[PDB]
Amino acid sequence: LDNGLARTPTMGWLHWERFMCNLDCQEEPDSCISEKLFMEMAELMVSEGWKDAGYEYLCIDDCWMAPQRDSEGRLQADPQRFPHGIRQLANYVHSKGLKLGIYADVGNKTCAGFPGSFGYYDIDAQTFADWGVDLLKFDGCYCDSLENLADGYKHMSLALNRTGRSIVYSCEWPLYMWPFQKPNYTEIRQYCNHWRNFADIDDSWKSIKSILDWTSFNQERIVDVAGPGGWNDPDMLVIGNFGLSWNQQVTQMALWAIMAAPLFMSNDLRHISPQAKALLQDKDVIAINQDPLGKQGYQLRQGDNFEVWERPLSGLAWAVAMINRQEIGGPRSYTIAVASLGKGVACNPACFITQLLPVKRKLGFYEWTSRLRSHINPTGTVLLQLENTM
Amino acid sequence: LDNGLARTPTMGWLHWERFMCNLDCQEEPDSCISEKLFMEMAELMVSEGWKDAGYEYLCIDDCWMAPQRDSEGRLQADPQRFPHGIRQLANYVHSKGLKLGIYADVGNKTCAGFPGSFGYYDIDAQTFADWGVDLLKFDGCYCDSLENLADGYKHMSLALNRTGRSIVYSCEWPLYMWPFQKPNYTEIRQYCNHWRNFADIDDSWKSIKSILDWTSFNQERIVDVAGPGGWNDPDMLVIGNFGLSWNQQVTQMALWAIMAAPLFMSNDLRHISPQAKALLQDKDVIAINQDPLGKQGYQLRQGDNFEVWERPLSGLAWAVAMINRQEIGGPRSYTIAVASLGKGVACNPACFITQLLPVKRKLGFYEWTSRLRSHINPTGTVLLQLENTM
Numbered sequence: 001l002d003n004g005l006a007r008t009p010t011m012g013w014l015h016w017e018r019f020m021c022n023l024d025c026q027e028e029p030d031s032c033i034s035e036k037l038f039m040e041m042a043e044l045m046v047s048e049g050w051k052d053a054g055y056e057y058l059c060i061d062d063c064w065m066a067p068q069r070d071s072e073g074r075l076q077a078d079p080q081r082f083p084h085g086i087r088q089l090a091n092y093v094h095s096k097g098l099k100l101g102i103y104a105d106v107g108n109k110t111c112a113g114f115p116g117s118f119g120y121y122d123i124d125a126q127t128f129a130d131w132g133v134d135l136l137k138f139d140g141c142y143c144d145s146l147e148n149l150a151d152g153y154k155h156m157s158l159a160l161n162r163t164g165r166s167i168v169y170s171c172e173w174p175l176y177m178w179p180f181q182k183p184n185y186t187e188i189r190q191y192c193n194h195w196r197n198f199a200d201i202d203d204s205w206k207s208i209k210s211i212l213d214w215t216s217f218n219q220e221r222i223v224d225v226a227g228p229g230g231w232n233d234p235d236m237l238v239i240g241n242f243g244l245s246w247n248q249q250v251t252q253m254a255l256w257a258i259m260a261a262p263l264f265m266s267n268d269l270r271h272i273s274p275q276a277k278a279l280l281q282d283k284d285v286i287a288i289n290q291d292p293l294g295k296q297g298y299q300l301r302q303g304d305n306f307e308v309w310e311r312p313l314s315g316l317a318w319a320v321a322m323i324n325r326q327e328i329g330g331p332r333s334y335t336i337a338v339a340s341l342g343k344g345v346a347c348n349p350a351c352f353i354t355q356l357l358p359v360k361r362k363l364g365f366y367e368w369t370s371r372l373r374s375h376i377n378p379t380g381t382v383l384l385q386l387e388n389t390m
Numbered sequence: 391l392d393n394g395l396a397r398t399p400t401m402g403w404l405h406w407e408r409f410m411c412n413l414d415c416q417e418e419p420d421s422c423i424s425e426k427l428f429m430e431m432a433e434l435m436v437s438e439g440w441k442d443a444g445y446e447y448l449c450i451d452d453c454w455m456a457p458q459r460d461s462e463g464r465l466q467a468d469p470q471r472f473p474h475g476i477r478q479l480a481n482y483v484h485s486k487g488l489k490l491g492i493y494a495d496v497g498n499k500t501c502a503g504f505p506g507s508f509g510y511y512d513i514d515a516q517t518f519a520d521w522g523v524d525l526l527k528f529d530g531c532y533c534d535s536l537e538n539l540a541d542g543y544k545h546m547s548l549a550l551n552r553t554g555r556s557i558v559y560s561c562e563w564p565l566y567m568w569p570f571q572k573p574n575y576t577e578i579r580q581y582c583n584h585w586r587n588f589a590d591i592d593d594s595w596k597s598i599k600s601i602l603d604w605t606s607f608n609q610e611r612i613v614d615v616a617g618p619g620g621w622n623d624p625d626m627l628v629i630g631n632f633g634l635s636w637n638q639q640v641t642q643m644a645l646w647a648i649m650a651a652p653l654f655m656s657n658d659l660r661h662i663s664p665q666a667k668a669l670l671q672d673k674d675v676i677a678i679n680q681d682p683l684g685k686q687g688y689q690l691r692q693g694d695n696f697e698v699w700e701r702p703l704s705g706l707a708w709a710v711a712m713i714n715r716q717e718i719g720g721p722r723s724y725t726i727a728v729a730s731l732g733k734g735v736a737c738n739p740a741c742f743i744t745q746l747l748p749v750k751r752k753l754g755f756y757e758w759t760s761r762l763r764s765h766i767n768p769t770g771t772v773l774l775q776l777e778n779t780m
Contacts, residue, residue: 020719031720202718203768205595242768243595243717247632268720327633328592329410330421330658378593378632 003161005168006193007228008290010135010262012057012101013041013050017201017236017266021063021112025081033063034081035089042093044269051097053281054290057135057168058093059101059264062112069115074127075104090132099134101168106152107143116142121156129163136160136167140176149176157191170233170262172196185225194231194262197222201235203243205379208252211235212323215259216299216307226260226296233262240267240276247380250358253279254321254383257289258297258311284356284385288319297321306334306376310342313385318342319356320384324376331380335373338366342386350389357383391547395558396583397618398680400525400652402447402491403431403440407591407626407656411453411502415471423453424471425479432483434659441487443671444680447525447558448483449491449654452502459505464517465494480522489524491558496542497533506532511546519553526550526557530566539566547581560623560652562586575615584621584652587612591625593633595769598642599715601625605649606689606697616650616686623652630657630666637770640748643669644711644773647679648687648701674746675773678709687711690731696724696766700732703775708732709746710774714766721767728760732776740779747773755779 015033025032042058045051064086066078077085090100104124109116117124117138128136138156143149153173160167171192174183188195198214201207211234215222226232237256239249256263265280279285288311297311297319305326311319320341322334338347351366358380366372374382405423415422432448435441454476456466467475480490494514499506507514507528518526528546533539543563550557561582564573578585588604591597601624605612616622627646629639646653655670669675678701687701687709695716701709710731714722728737741756748770756762764772 017718018720027723204717207717242635242637242721242770245633245635245638248635327594327596328407329412330408330631333418380632 001157001169001189001191001193001229003166003169003193003229005166005229006231008292008294009231009260010057010168010170010194010264011055011286011290012059012099012135012264013045013055013269014059014061014101014137014236014264014266015041016061017203017238018241018268019266023063023081032081035084038089039092041269042096042098045098046096048269048277050269050281053283054286055263055265057099057101057264059103059135059137061103061137062110062139063114064103065110065114067114073120073123075115075124086131086133094132100132101135101137101170102128102131102133103137103139105139105141106149106156107141109142111139111141117156118143118148118152121152121159125156125159125163128167129160129165133165133167135170137170137172139172146177146180149173153188154191168193170194182221185222189225189230193229194233196233196235198234201238203238203241205244205248207238208244208248209325212255212307216302219298223296223298226294228294231260231262232296234259236264236266237280238266239280240265240272245379246275247358247377249276249279250383251323251379251381253282253285254357254381255309255323257285257383258309258319258321260289260291260294260296260311263289282357284360285383288313288356288383288385301336306332308336312342316346316388316390318346318386320386322374322376322382322384324378324380327378329378331375331377333373333375335371338370338372339368341372346386346388352387352389353384355382355384357381391559391579391581391583391619393551393556393559393583393619395556395619396621396652398682398684399621399650400447400558400560400584400654401445401680402449402489402525402654403435403445403659404449404451404491404527404626404654404656406451407593407628408631408658409451409656413453413471422471425474428479429482431659432486432488435488436486438659438667439671440659443673444676445653445655447489447491447654449493449525449527451493451527452500452529453504454493455500455504457504463510463513465505465514476521476523484522490522491525491527491560492518492521492523493527493529495529495531496539496546497531499532501529501531507546508533508538508542511542511549512552515546515549515553518557519550519555523557525560527560527562529562536567536570539563543578544581559583560585572611575612579615579620583619584623586623586625588624591628593628593631595634595638597628598634598638602645602713609688613686613688616684618684621650621652622686624649626654626656627670628656629670630655630662635769636665637748637767639666639669640773641713641769641771643672643675644747644771645699645713647675647773648699648709648711650679650681650684650686650701653679672747674750674775678703678746678773678775691726696722698726702732706736706778706780708736708776710776712764712766712772712774714768714770716768719768721765721770723763723765725761725763728756728762729758731762736776736778742777742779743774745772746775747771
């Protein structure tokens with residue numbers, strides 16, 4: 001989508017995975033989906049230099065809206081949970097130098113069961129533009145057919161442009177299209193700033209394995225189309241929570257960088273290990289995700305429970321990631337010919353590799369003839385960055 | 391097994407999960423199964439007060455032996471990897487105040503492919519007793535029938551007593567009996583200090599889930615036989631490595647305690663997060679595992695992705711463990727009537743509950759009538775200990 005936006009993969013925070021559809025502010029006023037929660041996440045994104053580090057988009061997901069529409073046919077925030085409404089919430093967020101996402105659904109309802117947008121795209125866009133929204137996540141629950149779905153996504157996309165406001169448009173289109181026929185990715189790219197491809201993420205290594213595995217098994221399909229203004233979305237960063245171990249969290253952050261994926265954390269910024277904050281804010285790592293070139297990485301090699309992934313960067317740099325998939329034993333040793341690495345370009349004649357993760361130790365100079373030996377952790381990843389002599 | 395040993399569940403360290411069958415001391419001298427490894431683990435068990443904390447058995451698993459037997463028909467250490475042999479290694483360990491485990495296999499071979507003990511039980515026991523072995527793990531690979539397997543386990547047990555030395559006898563008997571018929575647990579209890587019931591553990595929550603689930607799906611069978619001198623073995627502690635998050639590691643430690651399991655660590659004592667150490671050495675928690683009573687705990691309640699486990703202790707105490715099995719969202723609240731707890735005894739009339747894990751906060755006094763409210767982390771467990779007013 002050529003709205004001149006998402007020129008690099010969007011970074012921000014999205015409530016869904018961690019905060020789900022919680023409507024109880026009796027007994028749990030803390031996880032409750034309410035302004036006080038966004039207002040507090042906003043307040044914090046500033047304090048702990050998430051914003052400094054590049055996360056700009058405070059995103060609301062499903063369950064913000066009241067049971068039904070008002071008198072004019074418009075949506076509204078839930079009266080009791082967003083007493084002040086969105087215009088004001090937006091307002092507040094902006095003031096802290098941030099940007100606001102909201103969520104809606106192509107069909108007759110959101111996935112939560114709340115009002116959908118079928119028949120209302122024109123009006124609904126306007127509302128959003130009106131409130132000062134900066135990003136919209138459109139979901140695909142509850143709709144007739146692929147015909148309709150395909151049209152809603154398009155029609156909504158058009159509408160948002162018509163409102164004349166910059167709004168990052170994040171679509172769940174492709175996901176809903178299987179298994180009814182592969183999606184035309186070039187089509188979607190023309191309408192969406194980014195798109196959800198596979199299942200939902202939850203707090204598990206299983207989840208992560210399977211997203212990686214699927215993105216992996218499907219690369220020709222998707223790796224090529226990705227580029228400035230239109231990214232593949234493998235889903236949120238769950239680093240921070242309860243499900244993944246350290247090496248597994250590095251596996252995520254490393255592979256979301258290789259993937260030129262958007263980076264929306266779903267976690268609780270109010271209680272977060274300080275080493276999860278460390279990872280999630282790694283400059284060099286974020287820079288890889290954010291590489292201005294925008295070419296999406298891919299899986300090079302596979303087998304003996306190891307995976308090799310690599311991504312071309314600007315200035316003849318590359319990122320390489322080695323995952324250990326063996327969930328037993330201790331850290332394993334792995335070696336590749338530095339020549340079979342960055343297409344055979346990076347390290348001809350000479351190479352400068354700094355390991356970025358899990359540590360950031362500079363390894364030396366590597367000859368075109370040289371081999372890279374490295375030790376990987378069970379379920380972890382080694383992420384390296386390569387430079388040239390040139 | 392009435393050898394007056396394992397009167398509480400054995401604590402030590404076993405190489406297998408973390409170190410597996412690693413024979414390359416060329417390129418990996420550090421994981422290589424070698425005396426230097428045990429020597430060094432021994433060295434460290436003392437330094438970092440693993441021994442202080444209760445872990446006493448330094449255990450060798452598969453792959454310590456030479457390709458075949460010597461001239462007299464005895465086993466022998468691999469010449470190159472155990473230049474000094476076992477008698478000396480044993481010796482060294484004892485001096486540090488520790489006890490030495492070894493591994494052998496009922497059939498024609500070990501699982502690694504190395505020499506089995508079919509036809510050699512009598513001699514082989516003697517060899518072990520000779521070296522100063524304090525524990526034997528007998529495995530069940532490569533043998534004809536249940537007929538034979540059943541006999542080897544018995545015969546070996548007999549033989550070890552005959553040597554006249556104290557040797558903890560750790561059997562893999564029941565495991566090799568399915569799916570060929572349920573095992574007679576009373577029978578096994580007469581010959582083994584403890585026994586492996588389910589599949590092998592690896593570094594994953596999957597593994598942990600599935601052991602828990604299976605032990606749980608099978609309690610009547612096994613829960614009741616366990617007592618002093620004869621324990622159910624759900625396999626090693628993998629806390630310390632790469633696979634499990636914090637809350638998952640607490641789930642293991644808590645649950646292995648409830649399960650009156652032996653505690654054999656398989657991790658690298660040389661590189662270990664210092665908060666994995668904390669947990670692994672939690673006195674209070676260790677206590678529960680070692681409760682002198684020796685009644686094994688069990689799963690009380692189940693569902694809505696929660697689990698309730700409890701164990702009777704001495705002096706009318708009980709441990710309760712609550713597991714949150716839901717791998718999405720945030721921490722959940724759970725409540726039980728304190729009355730429905732320790733069979734209804736514990737907290738009649740009154741109750742003193744201190745949470746042991748994941749923190750060790752004292753909660754108040756609880757009335758017989760009282761409810762326990764608690765909040766569990768996705769994939770975590772809350773471990774509570776309950777005392778009486780009496």
